[PDB]
Amino acid sequence: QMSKKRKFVADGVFFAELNEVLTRELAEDGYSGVEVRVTPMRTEIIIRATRTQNVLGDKGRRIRELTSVVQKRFNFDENTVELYAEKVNNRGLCAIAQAESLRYKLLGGLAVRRACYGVLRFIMESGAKGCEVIVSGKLRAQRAKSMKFKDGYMISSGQPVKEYIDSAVRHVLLRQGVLGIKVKIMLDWDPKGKQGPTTPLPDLVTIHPPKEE
Amino acid sequence: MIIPEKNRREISKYLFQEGVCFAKKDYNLAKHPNIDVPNLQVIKLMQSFKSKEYVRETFAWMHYYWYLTNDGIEFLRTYLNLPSEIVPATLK
Amino acid sequence: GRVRTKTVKKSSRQVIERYYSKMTLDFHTNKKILEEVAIIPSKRLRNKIAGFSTHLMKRIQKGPVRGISLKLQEEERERRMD
Amino acid sequence: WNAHPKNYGPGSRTCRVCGNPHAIIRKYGLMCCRQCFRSNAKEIGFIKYR
Amino acid sequence: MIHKIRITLSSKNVKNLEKVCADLVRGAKDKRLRVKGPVRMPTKVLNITTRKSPCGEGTNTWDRFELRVHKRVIDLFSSPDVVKQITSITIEPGVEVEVTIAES
RNA sequence: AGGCUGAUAACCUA
RNA sequence: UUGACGGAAGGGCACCACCAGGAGUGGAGCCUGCGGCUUAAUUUGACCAACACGGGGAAACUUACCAGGUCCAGACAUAGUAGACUGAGAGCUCUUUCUAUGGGUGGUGGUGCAUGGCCGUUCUUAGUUGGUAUUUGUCUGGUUAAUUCCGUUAACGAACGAGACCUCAGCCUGCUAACUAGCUAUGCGGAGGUUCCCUUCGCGGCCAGCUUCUUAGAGGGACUACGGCCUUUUAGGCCGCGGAAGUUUGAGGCAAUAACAGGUCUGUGAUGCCCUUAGAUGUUCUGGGCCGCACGCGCGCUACACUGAUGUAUUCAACGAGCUUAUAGCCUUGGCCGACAGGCCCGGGUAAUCUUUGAAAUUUCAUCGUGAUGGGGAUAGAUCAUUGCAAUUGUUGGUCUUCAACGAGGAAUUCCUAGUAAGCGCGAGUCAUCAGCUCGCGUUGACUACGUCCCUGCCCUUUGUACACACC
Ligand SMILES: *[C@@H]1O[C@H](CO)[C@@H](O)[C@H](O)[C@H]1O
Ligand SMILES: [K+]
Ligand SMILES: [K+]
Ligand SMILES: [K+]
Ligand SMILES: [K+]
């Protein structure tokens, strides 16, 4: 038995470490996040990935390996933890998925200008209020510089950034050094709460149209 | 790395019995938490498998994560001399 | 200082444009009207809009204002000139 | 080999994320160095309010 | 026959914690059980203050990190089986439910 | 020797 | 043409500017960081925006440095065939029962002027940008903390920053409701005073009641609303009632464009190239060093006393933190032993439950009496205990003794506008032991101003320019 303070910290450290382990094991499977749903008699781990068919493996072989190694590593009782793969509903509104998408294009050899506009164009087609892609490093010359690709709406300051901005940072290990990818997607107000935050922007005021009855 | 033949079997037995293994990057640790073999001998032996593609390696937060591959299962069966119908726990 | 920004001034004029009949010269009644006829995210923003609109209602009483288009008031002026 | 006692002091403790021995945060049992904690703070559940 | 059962709820999310507390009190008022609570313990504010810079150069700026823990205590006067029925409902994520027989 | 100056000269102090 | 600059002009602005002041710092002793010197080594980064900074309070470890001894923790692939010494029997013999080649791996090795990320800074100011050489938009004027607004108008309509926003604090005798928070009443009991009665204290009641005090959810509350006056019909400003609150109520968090060869390769299983890789720059072990002392500098601590020191009596916080239970590893009550330091025993607490019944300055009475004095407590001797595997180059904590400079600090210079400055202590980080540091917390509680552009800078406009590496 440990105190509440340490138990909550220990739960946060488990989530942070699990995400890192999956971020590297499932790097090339579109890994976009994880949700840890601890319940009586069972803790459920839901893995979000754009390409779920590669996370499950042939006849679920890989998802069973991940479950087994996770249970042993984190001192779980056998058959008391489950891993479930899941697909990202709107791949173009997830910055972590777009940052990894841009990463593999650059590794493959696609030009930076062309690759960054492909992501920028795809995100705006998916129904985003705006987007911004930044690539930094040794692009062609020995000296480093930054290229910024921006489109649409964006905010930087205040509380709304936490709810409306979806940002990710990734490193690309190229032959001449490391490029830095930053994808920053501004979401749109979704009252249903699925595509974006349900709470509106603080400065957005809406006047109801009067009725003639 | 001169692993005793008795310790070598335990690693292969455990690795074949369960298609995954893990270790903390701590060479001083006396015993592996899942095998009597010393922690270092587990890390070095599965480094040999990694170079022969018998396992797939992941590292994060000071821990190794190894996963058996199809070739690794083929090799371990001959080494352990077990019936061809037996498979690791992850394949069932 | 206490200068109202475009958010407060713009919203206040729109409210008075299409709810001039409902609005009154009382701040406390006007801020209950804004809850009914508008979606203002924060209470502090709602108070500033209600206070400035109440200021604009007093302006309209004495005469015409620049950025507010009151159709019924406009029709009265047209009849006067014609 | 590794005979020297390692029951207390900086040499006994290391960062759980990176393994570095410096600037370890031991409060609440975090056992992370100050640089790794700032990177992982949001995921752990810590937040900046003021 | 009737015993004072103590239910303790902990969470970082206030809205989820308050939602589960209402679901339990309202779920027990349907069975006409006597309910004491929810009692809100003082909020625990874990605090880590750390240097922003990964090196020691520049103005010494600090980040104050806070992790708030909210705790609720509900006492239900009923049998363990009935309480097990009320608490068995699905609980919101991040809310930790803990049922114990009050030592009185 | 200190101070003044980003620094030197000049200047000021001991 | 755009910028930058000007000992050019105009407008505006900032306690990292000044003014009016407060506390000081600079002088003394000491603590700690930097340079220099010394050294086997005294590892190293950094020079407004380095110098109690690298969370860098190093006994070992840390550790990068120095003197030495080990170990392989050299995957994979190819081809070949009891003694002597010693710091220590560590290794090497005795006794008992791998070698090339490529290719890797490790490295607190080098390059932050090859990089990612993060952070600092320009820059706390209000600034920046599309669509339809460069410019207009983005403005003469008024106004604002604000490129904030009102208006002007060859622009119109938008995007960022600002504001909004989020957190904490301030009001609620209203809502929700509490045996881990209390109050009031009542019952019983103790003590005092006059059997009732009165004062006071203790205990009890999940069927005394209740939520003022405490806790924390949901809401409410301020909008400059109202009055007077001043401003252009404006935007707005000054004063005032009421009000918990009338500076965007207070304080923070977040925070644009474009930049810097700013810092970090010594946070990282971030990383290119280079170096090294078994007489190793890998790793570990022993010992020393990082602290070494003619000297210069920076952040500080303690002081020079009577508005005090000492000895009594007395008395009021807030933020927070806490264990593997092994005899017991964390915070520790109570009892006993001891002058102290500390020790033994029974326990509580994984915590609004136990530590926590929880400070100091101050208040109060006495002593001291202007004397470097009972101010000051450096330096030093003797001795005791605690942490640790280990205390010497004193880890720290006690006891007696020793009793230095310092009598308010030159040129110069920092911070600060209200629960603030200053004083006063407390928790947390580091942590086996060690706080003169840092990050927070409360307690006591002011002087002065409500301005200005004189100094140091900043923003906008006009203007000059032979500057653009941009007046260094
Ligand atoms: C990737 O997509 C998930 C979808 O749930 C979203 O939650 C993350 O914010 C995004 O990065
Ligand atoms: K002084
Ligand atoms: K400093
Ligand atoms: K950099
Ligand atoms: K009595």
Ligand SMILES: [K+]
């Ligand atoms: K770095």
Ligand SMILES: [K+]
């Ligand atoms: K490097």
Ligand SMILES: [K+]
């Ligand atoms: K570190």
Ligand SMILES: [K+]
């Ligand atoms: K002394």
Ligand SMILES: [Mg+2]
């Ligand atoms: Mg904004």
Ligand SMILES: [Mg+2]
């Ligand atoms: Mg803001």
Ligand SMILES: [Mg+2]
């Ligand atoms: Mg001023």
Ligand SMILES: [Mg+2]
């Ligand atoms: Mg100054």
Ligand SMILES: [Mg+2]
């Ligand atoms: Mg002055």
Ligand SMILES: [Mg+2]
């Ligand atoms: Mg002083």
Ligand SMILES: [Mg+2]
């Ligand atoms: Mg001096």
Ligand SMILES: [Mg+2]
């Ligand atoms: Mg001095």
Ligand SMILES: [Mg+2]
């Ligand atoms: Mg500055």
Ligand SMILES: [Mg+2]
């Ligand atoms: Mg050392």
Ligand SMILES: [Mg+2]
């Ligand atoms: Mg050593």
Ligand SMILES: [Mg+2]
């Ligand atoms: Mg080394």
